[PDB]
Nucleic acid binder design. Structure first.
Ligand SMILES: [Mg+2]
Ligand SMILES: [Mg+2]
Ligand SMILES: [Mg+2]
Ligand SMILES: [Mg+2]
Ligand SMILES: [Mg+2]
Ligand SMILES: [Mg+2]
Ligand SMILES: [Mg+2]
Ligand SMILES: [Mg+2]
Ligand SMILES: [Mg+2]
Ligand SMILES: [Mg+2]
Ligand SMILES: [Mg+2]
Lengths: 222, 141, 361, 122, 55, 110, 256, 42, 106
RNA sequence: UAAAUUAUGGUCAAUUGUUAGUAUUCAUAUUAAUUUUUUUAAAUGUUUUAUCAUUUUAUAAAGGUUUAUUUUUGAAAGAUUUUUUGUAUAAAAUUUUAGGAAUAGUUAAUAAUAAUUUAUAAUUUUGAUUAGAUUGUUUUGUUAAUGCUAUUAGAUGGGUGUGGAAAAAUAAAAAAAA
RNA sequence: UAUACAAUUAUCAUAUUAAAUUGUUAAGUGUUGAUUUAACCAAUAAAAAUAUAAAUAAUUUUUAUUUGUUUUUAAACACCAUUAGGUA
């Protein structure tokens, strides 16, 4: 498409309400100042991407180490746990936020909304400074993490880290979803899933495993 | 956004998500989650057109893991059956039976996904097996 | 003098302005094309009542005392004394609930402070925007089903009614900002939605909203065409309120249904159960019916008391039956729509009718 | 195949119709707007059209904006072959509106479109 | 496309077919499809006080 | 606007031509537009659209017997009252009255 | 020439005449739309009809909702009397005095021997039935006729608390006529039609007054609106016209 | 060519072309959908 | 799928005659054939539609034409007050039962 | 959210132009047609009867219709000593013109009413009425195919109204009371 | 003469979820004269600076509303004509 304002292309892999990126009225992009880290200025920012590469990291799980006590004592901060990560984060774009169109584009001119970038003024911390301690001390909030008890964030974490998503998408090999599996071309992964009773197999589940094991093992391509 | 435009369907942009994510060689796609969409995923994963998939019981979306082989994708083409929601195509068992036949040789190479009166998401092969007709969703190979 | 004249010199892009010249200031339309010159006395009263100030109804103090008699007991011990514990927090469930002073500061929290401070947080010191939010919060509270209700129909309808009045008087002052003309029109549309959902949820509240804020002008069906096709009534089908009535409190359902096996209509089973459903009639239908009811008494009196006149008329009818177009009833004669079923006769042979369709079909 | 045949088993096509009452200016006569269906096989899709009918309500229950069930019957007058079989949804707001002496529904603001420009001021 | 129907060009045929298209049909939202412009600005100077019988 | 922005299709270039029109084509059509407009000016065209009349059908006032430029051609037949009023309109359009808004004037407007 | 050649209202076959008669032997002529003229137009109403044995005996007592003082109804009925008497003063004996206006919920025959057992037992059952029912706001508009145009009454519209009445009545109906066998002029499994009787022609009167109330009197008031009334008071009344100047009242129940 | 017909980038899968044809006029005539109101073929 | 199947003049491509009996009763047409105005142009309409497609009798479960969503079933669900969407759980248009259907045994 | 086999089943979808930088279904191709050829039609007098009469013998003239065309058994079939029945005229869908405005013996109630009964009437921009063109809802051609492209012909008002039914004024190819 | 667009990105005229609208400031006289222009001619010359937040998303505004033409020169520049003026 050679039409100006249609340059952003056809991307389906965005999160917006149109598959045509150039009809989207929400985030107008900035071709001059954007795309240092993301490649082209058209493409979605690192934190908004809904499609992921093989050798690239995927999104950090936000926290908002205490819970690794069971793990390797030396194991440092897990690469995917971040204090501040915002999937909704407004990136400053000039044509939206600083708009020089109605002016002659002289040095001070153009209309600016300051609601985008967090204020670096000292006015804020001065004006609000109080003897009462902050929200965290007061524990005003209900709820907590929206998923309830989470092994990484709230509760402690036991067992092993799966950094690739390999166990996280597997197909239950069983009617009970007790045993699950992951097959590559020539390899086969059988994973016992019973985290509640501490991986103690029942009579049915064991008689099942002796089926999945020898049906995986007597397979042609394994 | 207007009248003349097509009326999109979760299947339509499911297929186009996957197609575009296959062209950019991505490992994971986040994709719309509806009954027949994750039906389509289970069928594709049966035939091995897709490395894996999961529904996290997230309301909006679920995720698909794509498979590549010999440097290009495992999916040549993937196309939705209908452009609108206002158009619904019905597949006679004899039609789904024609697909299977390449001039006298039995061809399961290409897969067609469809709804049944029974709310099952099936490929055309099982459909022909039990001789039921179904509503078209998409083709993939 | 007589119709306006646009003069167009075709080399020019547009015509010259008309001769009578039109009004110098463009009329302000509502959403449907109807014209308002100024606020109606009712709406005017609403804004004059917003401007000078609002108030919390003692209704809230009352239900506060009946629901949580302990807390109200405490506040009742402590009046005039500065409070370090906000016992009154149940009285103001939401931030928005306290409008009597600026910044959502509840009344009884001002007990121990300076009177200057009290004047500085007063209503008189609000901006105009703050005052609007005040009126909105008060009304929202009076129509809300629970404290945190926003999205429900009554609330929505009211807040949109207010927003609409504000924008209207605003446009009255400074004539051209078409941004706000557009926002007023959109607001009016969403108000139309909210009200038409209300009358199928609870109609009395719908009524009293229309009577308080004087919006009946956006409930008027836009034009005869789309109304005649029943797409005005088709709205509450799309909204899903069409079957929502729950009859039994009103309109005993026994005479609303027809008999499937009998084939008799609802008027028939109503007849049989000795019930009468009939809409209240205007003077039209009343005087038509009351004219028709009496035909036979008038006739009996006529043919008793005046036989010769009658026999004259009868001569004419009886003899007429032999003259005329068709003497006997056949498919041709007994065609209910003659011009319709034979259109092929209309120009040439049959000169009576000049058109093939006089009715729906 | 549409809503109407979905709900009803009709002895003859168009023997049952569900619609809204639009206007009563005629005694014992309710005008009813009803939808039916058309299929375009080229594009494989359906459209809803609409049509008006005269229905016979003896006893005059129907208020403008009622949802009514309507049936085919004996020829009654030149244009009335249909009678009101049952009121599905009555108009409660409209009835209370009548009881107060007001019209059932406000009269539409503008009539049919014209090709002229009417300059009418004040 | 037979050349005798509608105009002498082809595209006239498809311009009258858009008149019959299913998803293009006239309804309560899209109205006056065939002459929109004869009816435009028709009531601008027609001043109609809206109907209120309720206070 | 009433009049036509363009005459003929001024944007004809190949698809994705990254401008509305090329120089060549736009110059051709600028020529044709020029000729038409010049014709309007010299023949002294006048059109009118009257309230409470069919609008699409515009009375051509430049052909009216009083305002007609040609001494030969039969002009047009318009109602006597209406035509008087049109003549008065055309006449009293000409000059600027103070307090009224300044509107563009030309030789060919008379 | 001004309408259909054969007007549709004039197409009529009489099947209660033998076949072949109308074709050859003779033609039968009648004004057929007096009969076809419907139940809405004539103003008739179908009351629960008595079995013959019950039809033989006079009714003695009845259930009534007592109209309070200061009614919309009583007022407007007085206005209607004024109008009617100014039109035709032959109505004067037909009309019921505004003092006797009451809602008739059902009619019943009590034999004179078992009188006290029945009144006590009825009164009790009545009090139990209406125990839970709060007052009733009912709407009156429209007129109707019972007994071939001899009784002229004000209809009770099923637009309001009427629904409750119907259950309530149908309960006493199933007690008074179901439980202790009492003669309710109808079936106890059938519901009575509540009404306010306005004009009436008694047997003695019928000779001087005529056999039916001419519809010319009340034609215009046929659909007239008499308004809404809330009712707290249920009576069981014996019909004596000289004891108190109001129907003699054997029992009472308060709805509250 | 701004003034002219839209062209596909590639062909259409013939198999899909045949799948979308299921409810077409010929199949309908075979199912018997249209009422026979006239004499038809002799 | 070919041209030979376009020709309904074969009896193998055409819904048989007897269907019209099964709908209107047996030997029902012999009446119609003796009618005054016949076959010029029109004859008493002959209803032949494969009995699994009948609009009268059949419904959304056995007939694929009823479960078309965007015109029949959309309206029906809007009216009855079920939640509905394009691609839904139930075969027809609907994600779930309405309130009435959930609270009442039919 | 698991694979499947007691193995090819339920009977064939398959596209052929020698172009001229490029963008866009457009010259020259095949099939189907008109150009194109006397091997399938046909001539006048219908016929009985009880005598100037009365029985039998019911849709090819034209006009141009797009919300349009709809009906019985009393004739014959038809069986038998005489009476015998009821069901019908109504509707629903599908309806054309590049640039689009109002239509009208007129709606509904009354009733075997009203050239002046009563009424806040009816048709229309969801495209009317006039006006052009046109013989309407198993028929063709092309094609691998949702398409595109054909289908004739036949119901043209009343005015002593016969007849079961108006279909009633040359123009068969229907055996019409031995 | 009949004989099969696109629907993943297509530039001239059928818009549509939008926060605007309103602000009374500046500038002016000493004196005897070639400024501006490539070049002509009329002929006092100085000047008009401030606003963010907030307004919720979608479902019946398409006869409604809307896309740089604008009172006041007794105020200029600018432009048009040429010393007469027009316009601003
Ligand atoms: Mg008709
Ligand atoms: Mg004609
Ligand atoms: Mg120019
Ligand atoms: Mg074909
Ligand atoms: Mg003929
Ligand atoms: Mg015509
Ligand atoms: Mg029809
Ligand atoms: Mg008809
Ligand atoms: Mg004649
Ligand atoms: Mg456009
Ligand atoms: Mg000026």
């Amino acid at each position: 498409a050679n039409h100006p304002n249609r340059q952003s292309g056809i991307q389906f892999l965005t999160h917006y309400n149109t598959h045509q990126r150039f009809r989207v009225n929400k985030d107008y992009i900035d071709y001059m100042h954007w795309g240092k880290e993301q490649g082209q200025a058209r493409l979605p920012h690192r934190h908004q991407r809904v499609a992921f590469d093989f050798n690239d990291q995927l999104h950090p799980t936000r926290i908002g180490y205490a819970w690794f006590a069971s793990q390797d004592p030396t194991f440092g901060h897990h690469p995917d746990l971040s204090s501040s990560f915002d999937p909704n984060y407004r990136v400053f774009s000039h044509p939206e936020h600083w708009n020089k169109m109605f002016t002659k584009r002289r040095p001070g001119e153009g209309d600016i909304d300051l609601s985008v970038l967090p204020s670096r003024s000292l006015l804020g911390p001065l004006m609000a400074h109080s003897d009462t301690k902050g929200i965290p001390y007061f524990k005003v909030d209900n709820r907590g993490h929206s998923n309830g008890r989470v092994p990484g964030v709230n509760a402690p974490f036991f067992g092993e880290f799966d950094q690739k998503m390999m166990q996280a998408m597997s197909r239950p090999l069983n009617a009970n979803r007790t045993i699950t599996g992951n097959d590559g071309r020539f390899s086969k992964t059988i994973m016992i899933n019973e985290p509640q009773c501490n991986q103690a197999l029942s009579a049915k589940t064991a008689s099942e495993l002796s089926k999945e094991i020898d049906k995986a093992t007597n397979a042609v391509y394994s | 956004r207007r009248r003349e435009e097509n009326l999109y369907t979760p299947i339509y942009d499911f297929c186009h998500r996957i197609r575009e994510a296959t062209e950019q060689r991505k490992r994971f796609v986040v994709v719309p989650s509806t009954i027949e969409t994750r039906g389509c995923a289970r069928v594709m994963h049966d035939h091995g057109l897709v490395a894996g998939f999961r529904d996290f019981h997230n309301d909006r979306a679920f995720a698909v893991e794509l498979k590549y082989f010999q440097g290009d994708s495992t999916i040549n083409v993937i196309e939705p059956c209908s452009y609108d929601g206002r158009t619904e195509f019905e597949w006679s068992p004899k039609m789904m039976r024609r697909l299977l036949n390449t001039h006298g040789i039995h061809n399961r190479l290409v897969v067609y996904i469809c709804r049944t009166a029974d709310n099952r998401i099936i490929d055309h092969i099982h459909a022909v097996k039990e001789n039921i007709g179904g509503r078209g969703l998409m083709m993939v190979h | 003098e007589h119709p306006a004249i646009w003069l167009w010199y075709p080399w020019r892009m547009n015509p010259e302005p008309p001769t009578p010249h039109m009004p110098q200031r463009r009329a302000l339309k509502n959403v449907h094309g109807a014209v308002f010159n100024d606020l109606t006395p009712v709406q005017k009263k609403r804004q004059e009542q917003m401007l000078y100030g609002v108030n919390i109804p003692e209704t809230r103090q009352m239900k506060f005392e009946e629901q949580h008699p302990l807390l109200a007991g405490a506040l009742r011990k402590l009046e005039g004394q500065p409070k370090g514990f906000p016992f009154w927090y149940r009285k103001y469930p939401t931030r928005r609930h306290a409008y009597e002073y600026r910044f959502s500061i509840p009344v009884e929290m001002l007990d121990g402070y300076n009177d200057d401070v009290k004047k500085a947080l007063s209503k008189g010191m609000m901006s105009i925007q703050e005052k609007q939010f005040a009126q909105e919060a008060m009304y929202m509270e009076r129509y809300a089903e629970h404290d945190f209700d926003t999205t429900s129909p009554a609330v929505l309808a009211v807040k949109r009614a207010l927003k609409c009045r504000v924008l209207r008087n605003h446009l009255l002052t400074n004539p051209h900002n078409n941004i706000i003309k557009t926002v007023l029109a959109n607001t009016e549309r969403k108000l139309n939605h909210a009200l038409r959902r209300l009358r199928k949820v609870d109609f009395k509240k719908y009524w009293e909203i229309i009577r308080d804020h004087d919006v009946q002008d956006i409930l008027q069906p836009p034009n005869l065409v789309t109304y005649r096709q029943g797409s005005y009534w088709k709205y509450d089908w799309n909204a899903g309120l069409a079957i929502s009535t729950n009859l039994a409190d009103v309109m005993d359902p026994r005479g609303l249904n027809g008999c499937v096996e009998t084939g008799r209509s609802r008027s028939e089973v109503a007849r049989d159960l000795g019930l009468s459903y009939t809409r209240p009639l205007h003077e039209n239908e009343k005087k038509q019916l009351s004219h028709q009811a009496v035909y036979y008494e008038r006739l009996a009196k006529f043919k008793m008391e005046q036989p010769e006149a009658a026999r004259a008329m009868e001569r004419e009818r009886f003899v007429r039956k032999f003259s005329g177009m068709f003497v006997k009833m056949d498919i041709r004669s007994g065609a209910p729509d003659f011009p319709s079923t034979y259109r092929r006769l209309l120009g040439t042979k049959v000169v009576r009718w000049a058109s093939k369709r006089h009715g729906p079909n | 195949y549409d809503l109407t045949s979905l709900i009803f088993n009709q002895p003859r096509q168009g023997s049952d119709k569900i619609g809204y009452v639009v206007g009563t200016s005629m005694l014992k006569t309710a005008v009813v707007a009803t939808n039916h269906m058309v299929y375009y096989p080229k594009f494989n899709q359906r459209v809803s059209r609409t049509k008006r009918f005269f229905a016979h309500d003896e006893d005059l229950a129907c208020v403008e904006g009622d949802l009514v069930h309507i049936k085919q019957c004996r020829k009654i007058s030149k244009y009335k072959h249909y009678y009101v079989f049952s009121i599905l949804e009555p108009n409660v707001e409209g009835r209370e509106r009548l009881k107060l002496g007001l019209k059932a529904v406000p009269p539409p603001l503008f009539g049919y479109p014209v090709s002229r420009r009417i300059v009418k001021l004040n | 496309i037979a050349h005798w129907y509608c105009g002498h060009k082809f595209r006239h045929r498809f311009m009258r077919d858009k008149r019959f298209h299913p998803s293009l049909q006239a309804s309560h939202d899209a109205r006056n499809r065939f002459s929109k412009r004869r009816h435009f600005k028709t009531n601008r100077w027609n001043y109609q006080q809206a109907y209120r019988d309720m206070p | 606007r009433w009049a036509a922005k363009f005459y003929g299709q001024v944007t004809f270039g190949p698809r994705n031509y990254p401008y509305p029109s090329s120089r060549w084509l736009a110059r051709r059509f600028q020529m044709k537009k020029h000729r038409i407009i010049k014709r309007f000016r010299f023949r002294r065209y006048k059109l009118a659209a009257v309230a409470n009349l069919p609008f699409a059908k515009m009375i051509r006032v430049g052909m009216l017997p009083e305002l007609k430029s040609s001494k030969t051609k039969r002009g047009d037949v318009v109602d006597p009252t209406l035509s008087g009023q049109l003549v008065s309109a055309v006449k009293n359009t000409g000059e600027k009255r103070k307090g009224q808004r300044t509107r563009p004037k030309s030789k060919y407007q008379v | 020439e001004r309408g259909l050649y054969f007007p549709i209202n004039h197409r009529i076959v009489d099947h209660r005449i033998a076949p072949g008669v109308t074709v050859e032997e003779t033609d039968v002529q009648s004004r057929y739309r007096r009969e076809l003229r419907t139940n809405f137009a004539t103003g008739e109403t179908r009351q629960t009809i008595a079995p013959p044995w019950s039809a033989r005996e006079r009714p003695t007592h009845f259930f009534s909702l007592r109209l309070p003082s200061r009614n919309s109804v009583t007022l407007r009925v007085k206005e209607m009397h004024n109008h009617l008497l100014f039109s035709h003063q032959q109505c004067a004996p037909m009309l019921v005095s505004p003092t006797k206006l009451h809602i008739t919920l059902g009619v019943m025959t009590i034999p004179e021997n078992s009188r006290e057992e029945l009144v006590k037992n009825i009164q009790q059952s009545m009090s139990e039935t209406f125990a839970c029912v709060q007052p009733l706001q009912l709407r009156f508009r429209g007129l109707g006729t019972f007994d071939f145009g001899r009784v002229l009454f004000i209809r009770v519209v099923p637009e309001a608390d009427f629904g409750r009445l119907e259950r309530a009545v149908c309960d006493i109906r199933r007690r008074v006529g179901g439980v202790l066998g009492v003669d309710l002029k109808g079936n106890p499994h059938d519901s009575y039609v509540p009404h306010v009787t306005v004009a009436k022609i008694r047997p003695n009167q019928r000779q001087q007054l005529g056999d039916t109330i001419p519809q010319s009197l009340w034609a215009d008031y046929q659909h007239h609106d008499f308004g809404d009334v809330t009712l707290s008071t249920v009576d069981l009344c014996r019909m004596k016209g000289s004891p108190d100047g109001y129907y003699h009242t054997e029992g009472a129940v308060h709805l509250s | 060519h701004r003034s002219g017909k839209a062209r596909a980038f590639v062909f259409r899968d013939p198999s899909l072309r045949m799948m979308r044809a299921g409810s077409g006029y010929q199949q309908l005539r075979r199912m018997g959908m249209p009422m026979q109101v006239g004499m038809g073929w002799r | 799928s070919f041209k030979y199947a376009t020709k309904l003049q074969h009896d193998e491509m055409r819904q048989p005659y007897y269907i019209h009996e099964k709908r209107y009763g047996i030997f029902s047409n012999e009446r119609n054939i003796a009618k005054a105005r016949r076959g010029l142009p029109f004859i008493t309409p002959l209803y032949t539609k494969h009995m699994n497609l009948w609009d009268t009798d059949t419904d959304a479960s056995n007939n694929r034409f009823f479960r078309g969503y965007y015109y029949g079933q959309r309206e029906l669900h809007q009216l009855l007050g079920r939640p509905h969407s394009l691609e839904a759980t139930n075969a027809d248009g609907s994600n779930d039962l309405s309130t009435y259907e959930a609270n009442t045994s039919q």
